[PDB]
Design a protein around this ligand. Structure first.
Ligand SMILES: *C[C@@]1(O)CC[C@@H](OC(=O)N[C@H]2CC[C@H](N)CC2)[C@@H](OC)[C@@H]1[C@@]1(C)O[C@H]1CC=C(C)C
Ligand SMILES: *C[C@@]1(O)CC[C@@H](OC(=O)N[C@H]2CC[C@H](N)CC2)[C@@H](OC)[C@@H]1[C@@]1(C)O[C@H]1CC=C(C)C
Ligand SMILES: [Mn+2]
Ligand SMILES: [Mn+2]
Ligand SMILES: [Mn+2]
Ligand SMILES: [Mn+2]
Lengths: 368, 369
């Protein structure tokens, strides 16, 4: 049985390391209006599903860790904690529940805790004195992996009830996206469905009424092994690509709602970085740059990381080396993404598997 | 009194004054503040605490000397073409003689592991197993001895094909690294970190494919207590294991497992290994055959691990339903073979260490490993 606080690894909580299934769903009709209810009992597909069970079960492990960590977080997170203390406490728990081991099992990406008008890609760097406040709207977006099978899953934390209708709107939009996803479904059609739900909500906050806007330049995304962004984008507005979702793909279905302009730009200090896949052996002159790349290779590979995570490894005076890797195309920065000052943004996100026999919301909990 | 070839003289008769050989003794690693632990070596207070437990250390050392002599003998004859049953019976017959087996007073601490290939741990043949050791096999010989419930848990990997040499080197280095990192007040996950750093640093090319050597993340070393092979602390072989600290006077099995596969094990094949749980002390029993099987386990094994071959040789038959019964009642636990993916290769090295007041003793160290 799990400790309180959690300390027992998921791999030791389940007989023979067979982990709980998420929500399983029949596929929605395609554009032609056909149901694929045949998948459910097709023997071809049942076999094809079983053939990748090892993969689905790894996703499930990482999903169960996600659920336990987030319930733990949901038991202590409060105003007056530093964002640093929040992320450290969450991440400490994640490492223990996933029984982290270098690139074999671990944290898939930094703990997002984006506040207020900032929608995504904020985590504190060293020295950040930001404190979580009663009237903050905080997007907790964190990830776990087993063998590079990533869970990307997120929710919004608040303490003031005035944000309740905003959270309801985005939760609805995300659940709509999840319901509309399936094999042979066009990516644009998911985006259209999300937008029509999102935009049906108007919220009143501090005596002002706002039209809930989808953040039009934020997206969900396909996931591949060690590759958080595998190259298909899931729009959250109408008019995305006609590309179809395909059997065996894995998607992060996420939506963002704003009371602001409904669009993000780069803002505040960068915390998040990630080595690029495509890039080959670009030559490196400087010792500090070579060293930083070795630390990145050993600890992260192609997974996202943050400055705090380099600090905790004993790295120092690495910022110009990090800039050097960025300039060389070896690493990309991912700065915080913000709507206008004074706006409010909310997010919900799950990871779904497009298994040959059903759609699995592998990260679904009793919470969201 | 000198040892025969094959070995036949009990260790207790080979050292007729009853004082058995020390293992490798080592100074403790520096504390996390960077300070030396060398004061323990010459501390009068630590020397006295050490000597108050000399009876205990000395019983481990007789068990360790038996282990050394058995495994040397095993290495002199183990070869392809022998059955796994032949290997285990030959090993076990020697172990019994050298330890001077007598009930729970002295004996075999647990069944002879001889896990093959993708199987990492907890395989021993049952009756009727026709498995033959092959040139291409990678075999983990993991066997234990005890004197008065002072257990030696110690293991090595047997191969005949040089293609596995680099995997064996990685795992031995990892184990030796773990042994070196161990000490009083050291966190168990820090031992795991040192180990994982060593395994990470190896790649092996087998059958034309290059593999990253992975620690088996869901396997651990463990603390040892009297007649208690797993005394409740785990020594992870990865960073992400428990933060709990090692303590003075504890005994650990420091073992590492390396894999070319996923780095994770699952249950597979027929279960051979079983062991009575420590606390289940008056869970009442209604079926006679079950009550008899328990009596036999109590008399012969107590809380030490056993296997089905060791019930067979006691003249017990038709007991699988009763053993399942003891399992279902929570009196006994099964320990099925633990195996990475088909076609993967797993290796292991293990030693027993004593966290003595004055020094760390690698009690089961030999000239072999
Ligand atoms: C971090 C991420 O998941 C947030 C949602 C997605 O972000 C976008 O849609 N990003 C942009 C694109 C450029 C634009 N000027 C502004 C908005 C998602 O990308 C689809 C993000 C993700 C997966 O890129 C990753 C990297 C992962 C991490 C840095 C943790
Ligand atoms: C036999 C044993 O020494 C092999 C190494 C250890 O095994 C594990 O760590 N097993 C895991 C496997 C996954 C599971 N979720 C949790 C346990 C070791 O355990 C520490 C094993 C040992 C000591 O369990 C004992 C029993 C001893 C015998 C059966 C001989
Ligand atoms: Mn996310
Ligand atoms: Mn995402
Ligand atoms: Mn062992
Ligand atoms: Mn052991």
């Amino acid at each position: 049985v799990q400790t309180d606080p959690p300390s027992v690894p998921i791999c030791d909580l389940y007989p023979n390391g067979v982990f709980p299934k998420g929500q399983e769903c029949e596929y929605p009709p395609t554009q032609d209006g056909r149901t694929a209810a045949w998948r459910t009992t097709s023997e071809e597909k049942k076999a094809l599903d079983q053939a990748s069970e090892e993969i689905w079960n790894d996703f499930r492990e990482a999903a169960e860790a996600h659920r336990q960590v987030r319930k733990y977080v949901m038991s202590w997170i409060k105003p007056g904690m530093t964002m640093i203390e929040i992320c450290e406490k969450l991440e400490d728990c994640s490492r223990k529940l996933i029984k982290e081991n270098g690139l074999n099992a671990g944290l898939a990406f930094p703990t997002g805790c984006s506040l207020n008008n900032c929608a995504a890609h904020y985590t504190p760097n060293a020295g950040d004195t930001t404190v979580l406040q009663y009237d903050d709207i905080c997007k907790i977006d964190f990830g776990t992996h087993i063998s590079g099978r990533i869970i990307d899953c997120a929710f919004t934390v608040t303490f003031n009830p005035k944000y309740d209708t905003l959270l309801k709107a985005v939760k609805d939009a995300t659940n709509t996206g999840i319901k509309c996803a399936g094999i042979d479904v066009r990516l644009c059609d998911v985006g259209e469905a999300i937008q029509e739900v999102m935009e049906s909500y108007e919220v009143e906050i501090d005596g002002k009424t706002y039209q809930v806007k989808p953040i039009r330049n934020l997206n969900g995304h396909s996931i591949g092994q060690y590759r958080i962004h595998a190259g298909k984008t899931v729009p959250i507005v109408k008019g995305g690509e006609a590309t179809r979702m395909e059997e065996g793909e894995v998607y992060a279905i996420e939506t963002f709602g704003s009371t602001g302009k409904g669009v993000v730009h780069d803002d505040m200090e960068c915390s998040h970085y990630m080595k690029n896949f495509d890039v080959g052996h670009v030559p490196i002159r400087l010792p500090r740059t070579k060293h930083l790349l070795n630390v990145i290779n050993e600890n992260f590979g192609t997974l996202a990381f943050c400055r705090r995570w380099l600090d905790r490894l004993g790295e120092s005076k690495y910022l110009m080396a990090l800039k050097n890797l960025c300039d060389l195309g070896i690493v990309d920065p991912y700065p915080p993404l913000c709507d206008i000052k004074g706006s409010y943004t909310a997010q919900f996100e799950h990871t779904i598997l497009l298994r040959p026999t059903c759609k699995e919301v592998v990260s679904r909990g009793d919470d969201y």
